[PDB]
Design a protein around this ligand. Structure first.
Ligand code: PRO
Ligand code: PRO
Ligand code: NA
Ligand code: NA
Ligand code: NA
Ligand code: NA
Lengths: 484, 484
């Protein structure tokens, strides 16, 4: 069958991937006792947008549920799936003649049917008529709450839909649950996004020089990913934190736009991941700007390397993700005590939630078509109201096919440290005279992407990780990638 | 005073630029008979957005009118200007403590006052109280129609605004008119955006090889612009049309995403321009993929070079822009006849609107904070209802301080050519035996950015343009060219 491909060495993604997702969705819906025979899933694709009131077009990236089901790159589409038969119909815009002048070839419906391997293609202006003739019992539309944004996913609508019976409650939890478990075809794409992003991270480590701006490495990363990987988008805005900025978890946004000069002695924390055909990656590498770890940098870094590998070594089906978060906390506290930043009973530190002072974010999250992927908190799974753990993007138990980031870190964040020092229950553990040396250190985060397997995990990421590996990588002479 | 700067060799942009814009706006409003004493201009800045219902942040780019007035890069702001005194107040978001962890330093109001050189800074939730205490006669808000998108610009609103007298008709045409005329400080930035984008176009011409994907050059262009120019954004999505795709005017969007393999014998038409601190550039270079113009390619290319230079040579204050469009049409028709593609009376060809078959778009447009900048069709300026001319983005007369693109082109667009061949009023001019040779040629566009001056124009763009200059550049030559 047909495949998506951007040529050269980029990955061929079979459109059969999306056909399988549609099949899996139907199979799950058929098992739901509330779903009536003759139901039709109706999804609305993303539309083209502009900057504010201007005619400046924004590059179109497909809505994630619609992509998951259909893999369609064009704006203005709808897609439907007959639940009982699995038959798929794509609706494409009926374009005006001038499209041929300004935008490109006006493809036929047959072209799209062949391109996407759906059962039928019709024009968008005919959706009401086509759905009417199919005599559905109910239209199943998509509405639910994203548990990372808190936003409500907005259901499909079209002129004439009011003539139909519409249910907007059944679909969302079911299609979310399908997205949580990656097919082998999806895993091949995530292996690829991790491959290219790993290569790009390595090029960045090789290219970093004292005196560069953070954004020069953001630029290089995205250039490698696009030109060599066909990744036109990043999965999220690149986080290129040097020095104290490495303590800022989502650094790099418009308000703090990767505009610091990298200085001798800085730690770098680069959290970047290219996106291919709307599939994510998310990798974080931490390393000394000047290519040589100081003793303090080595100690902090190897603490996070220890929790990283301990968590990965413990992950397997049945493991409760919050237990892995707490494992990382305990290891960080042990290591920080060995360094002399902390003193006392680590058991007592844990009871006082001291780990969250140093790692205020969740250990890791589902990853897929969205970098913070759906399904972390389905009905019945509750958010734990404790420091650190409350930022976990899932409290589920691990099962095969789940894809997770594993991203422990240790940071020196002034307002968290100061809070802790004011609290007698935590302050006794902190050795101020030692901690003072680490103010402005920033932080270390080591982020791998992994798949849960029957017996443990598969590691998707491949970057240097030991102190020796990193120093060797940065000292490498290889001009494998030299723009200009 | 303070400056915007991204370090290295990037341009320092004084915040005095925006203070001057505010002053110019007030001065214009004070002369406006509809404006009362005690009026306050109220603008609302752009807000942060996400992809659909996800928490995937979209990189924030400021709304263009708000940028013009304040130069503010942070999302969630408002800004007001007291018309009678020119006093400026910036309203910034009151951030949650957790911002310090995830997003970065929670800057003081004084930090922002100093950063932006405004007269006062307040928190956004205090805007109703602050405005109330000033006892304004009327709030002047922004509402009007963009004549390129047809969209209505969104006026500012805040909780409590209903307690004020609000006028939303006066401001838009006045602030648009200010934007039409660039200050010397604004011209410094547009000189810079053209410098970097010109350098990037030159790097692309040096790097292009047969067998590359179009998007590899898009990536390279953007990487040059960001890493060397500090241009995090492009002004619009890169148009990298090879072969037949060079006849597609806005090629490169999601539906036609720069994914063709460049072939020997192809013409390339690359329309790309980096954006610096929300100031545009827009440059188009046309060249043979293999670095050597064929005779046919040379002929089409030099026809557009002739119209380009004729227009630039004719432009000066008082010139009616549609007359320049018609001048380009006439030159294209003359040269196409000189090539044997057309025969007969060129006067008659013009009368038959034959020029629009080969150049279906407008000769050029205002450029500024938006690539298709505001103010092309103010009240009283009408769109000309003829092929080609109706696509003009302005029908104004040129005056000093206007910035325009000059972008004639010749394309071989099958459905337009076939229309002409079916039309007895046009068909006899076309020589099919020669024209058949140019089917699938694509097209040539040569686009310069220029400023209208007292004596003529100032050319901002600096790329190779003659056949010899282009072949030299592609062969790797250092500035082997001299501008018009
Ligand atoms: O947002 C999250 O969950 C992770 C934590 C650090 C950056 N990304
Ligand atoms: O949109 C416009 O006006 C010009 C014409 C060619 C591409 N950009
Ligand atoms: Na991360
Ligand atoms: Na992550
Ligand atoms: Na253009
Ligand atoms: Na243009």
């Amino acid at each position: 069958g047909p495949s998506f491909w951007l040529g050269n060495e980029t990955l061929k993604v079979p459109l059969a991937l999306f056909a399988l997702n549609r099949q899996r969705l139907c199979e799950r819906l058929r098992k739901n006792p509330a779903v009536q025979a003759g139901s039709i899933v109706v999804l609305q694709g993303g539309e083209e947008t502009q900057r504010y009131c201007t005619d400046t077009g924004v590059l179109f990236r497909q809505e994630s549920f619609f992509h998951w089901a259909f893999g369609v790159t064009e704006p203005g589409c709808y897609g439907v799936i007959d639940v009982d038969t699995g038959k798929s119909t794509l609706f494409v815009p009926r374009l005006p003649a001038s499209h041929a002048t300004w935008m490109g070839k006006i493809h036929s419906k047959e072209h799209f049917k062949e391109k996407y391997a759906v059962d039928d293609v019709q024009y968008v202006d005919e959706i009401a008529s086509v759905l009417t003739s199919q005599k559905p019992s109910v239209l199943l539309t998509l509405r639910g709450v994203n548990t990372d944004s808190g936003s409500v996913c907005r259901e499909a609508s079209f002129d004439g839909i009011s003539k139909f019976e519409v249910n907007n409650t059944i679909l969302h939890p079911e299609i979310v649950e399908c997205r949580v478990f990656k097919t082998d075809m999806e895993l091949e794409v995530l292996r690829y996004t991790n491959k290219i992003s790993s290569e790009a991270h390595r090029e960045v480590m090789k290219a970093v020089k004292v005196g560069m701006k953070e954004y020069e490495l953001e630029s290089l990363f995205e250039h490698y990913c696009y030109s060599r990987g066909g990744m036109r988008h990043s999965s999220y805005t690149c986080i290129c934190g040097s020095g104290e900025n490495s303590a800022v978890l989502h650094y790099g946004h418009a308000g703090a736009p990767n505009d610091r000069t990298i200085q001798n002695g800085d730690m770098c924390l680069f959290d970047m991941g290219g996106e291919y055909y709307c599939f994510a990656s998310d990798i974080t590498c931490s390393f000394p700007a000047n290519g040589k770890f100081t003793a303090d940098q080595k100690a902090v870094y190897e603490a996070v390397l220890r929790s990283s590998r301990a968590v990965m070594g413990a992950m397997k089906p049945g493991v409760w993700w919050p237990d892995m978060h707490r494992l990382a906390d305990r290891i960080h506290l042990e290591e920080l005590a060995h360094m002399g930043i902390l003193s006392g009973s680590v058991d007592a530190m844990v009871q006082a939630h001291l780990g969250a002072v140093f790692m205020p974010h969740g250990l890791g999250h589902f990853l897929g078509i969205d970098v913070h992927d759906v399904g972390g908190y389905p009905e019945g799974v509750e958010r734990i109201d404790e420091p650190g753990l409350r930022s976990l993007r899932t409290a589920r138990h691990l099962q095969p096919g789940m894809v997770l980031t594993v991203e422990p870190g240790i940071y020196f964040i002034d307002h968290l440290l100061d809070e802790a020092l004011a609290d007698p229950a935590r302050a006794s553990f902190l050795n101020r005279e030692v901690l003072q040396r680490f103010r402005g250190f920033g932080g270390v985060r080591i982020e791998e992407d992994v798949v849960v397997t029957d017996s443990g995990i598969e590691l998707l990421t491949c970057v240097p990780r030991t102190v020796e590996e990193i120093e060797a990588c940065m000292a490498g002479c290889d001009k494998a990638f030299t723009p200009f």
